[PDB]
Amino acid sequence: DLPQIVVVGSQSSGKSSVLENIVGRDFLPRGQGIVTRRPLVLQLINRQSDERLADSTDKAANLDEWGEFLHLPGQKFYDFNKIRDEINRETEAKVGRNAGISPAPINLRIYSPHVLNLTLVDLPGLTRVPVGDQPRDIERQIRDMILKYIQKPNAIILAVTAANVDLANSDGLKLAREVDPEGQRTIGVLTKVDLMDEGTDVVDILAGRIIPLRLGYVPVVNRGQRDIDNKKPITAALEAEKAFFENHKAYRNKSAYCGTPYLARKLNLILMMHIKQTL
Numbered sequence: 001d002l003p004q005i006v007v008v009g010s011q012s013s014g015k016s017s018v019l020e021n022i023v024g025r026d027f028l029p030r031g032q033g034i035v036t037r038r039p040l041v042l043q044l045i046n047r048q049s050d051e052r053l054a055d056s057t058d059k060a061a062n063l064d065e066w067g068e069f070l071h072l073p074g075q076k077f078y079d080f081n082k083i084r085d086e087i088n089r090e091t092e093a094k095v096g097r098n099a100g101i102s103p104a105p106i107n108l109r110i111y112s113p114h115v116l117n118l119t120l121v122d123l124p125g126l127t128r129v130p131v132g133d134q135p136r137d138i139e140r141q142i143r144d145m146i147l148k149y150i151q152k153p154n155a156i157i158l159a160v161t162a163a164n165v166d167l168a169n170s171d172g173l174k175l176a177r178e179v180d181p182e183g184q185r186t187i188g189v190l191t192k193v194d195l196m197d198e199g200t201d202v203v204d205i206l207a208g209r210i211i212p213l214r215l216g217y218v219p220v221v222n223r224g225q226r227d228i229d230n231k232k233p234i235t236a237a238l239e240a241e242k243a244f245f246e247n248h249k250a251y252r253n254k255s256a257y258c259g260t261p262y263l264a265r266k267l268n269l270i271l272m273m274h275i276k277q278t279l
């Protein structure tokens, strides 16, 4: 149907962290062995610019930003800690906790003056060894779920790989190549650039010398686990990401092509081009 950006990669590649960095505020459940177990179809809606904010545990809530769930019609979520709770609820309701997965999507809209018009689909990450109560063929079930999404020619494939692993072992690029070998609709993200072995960088990847992608790669820096535990706001994380690329010798002169702000503009631009070619 409509074009959308499907986020694919290994478990703990940083897929959920990228979505939070794009939104600008944290709203996804994490910790306690919690991972994405249902597709989150996230629709971001730009919207240029009190009793409704009375019972808010989110210090940043405001009337210009809120979320809406398709299965909870009429409700507007101004507190993003309740968005997290509801996502955790809907997931456990259909697939319990730390068990298998379900293809039933959770549909969430978020209005904001700070987001571009994008549709992103967070998919479960590939793992290799079952833990907890997972079915022993959990790897196959996740692969088959991903392929069903990215086989569709309207799907823009956001292949997420951690920069502190060998690019050639990327699950995201493998799956992207299986359905889109020419790279016509695959765009890469390189996370955890701040965790790279000292002396290494991703410049060779950006210059197309390893696994070329015509739509390119974008390096980013999301919140680390310490930042999550300390409740560091995404706004501060974005400031930290900007400073990282502007003071690193390898990225200083190319920093306009680094970071989540550029990724969002790039996804928005690619998404508009993809629509133009639909008749």
Ligand SMILES: Nc1nc2c(ncn2[C@@H]2O[C@H](COP(=O)(O)OP(=O)(O)O)[C@@H](O)[C@H]2O)c(=O)[nH]1
Residues within 6 Å of the ligand: 009, 010, 011, 012, 013, 014, 015, 016, 017, 018, 030, 035, 036, 125, 191, 192, 193, 194, 195, 220, 221, 222, 223, 224, 225, 226, 228
């Ligand atoms: N230092 C650092 N940690 C990151 C970065 N991106 C993600 N992480 C951490 O990597 C872990 C997995 O990230 P997450 O978004 O939950 O992974 P997912 O399973 O792909 O959605 C978490 O502990 C994140 O804090 C990054 O750019 N830098």
Ligand SMILES: [Mg+2]
Residues within 6 Å of the ligand: 015, 016, 035, 036, 122, 123, 124, 125
């Ligand atoms: Mg995830």
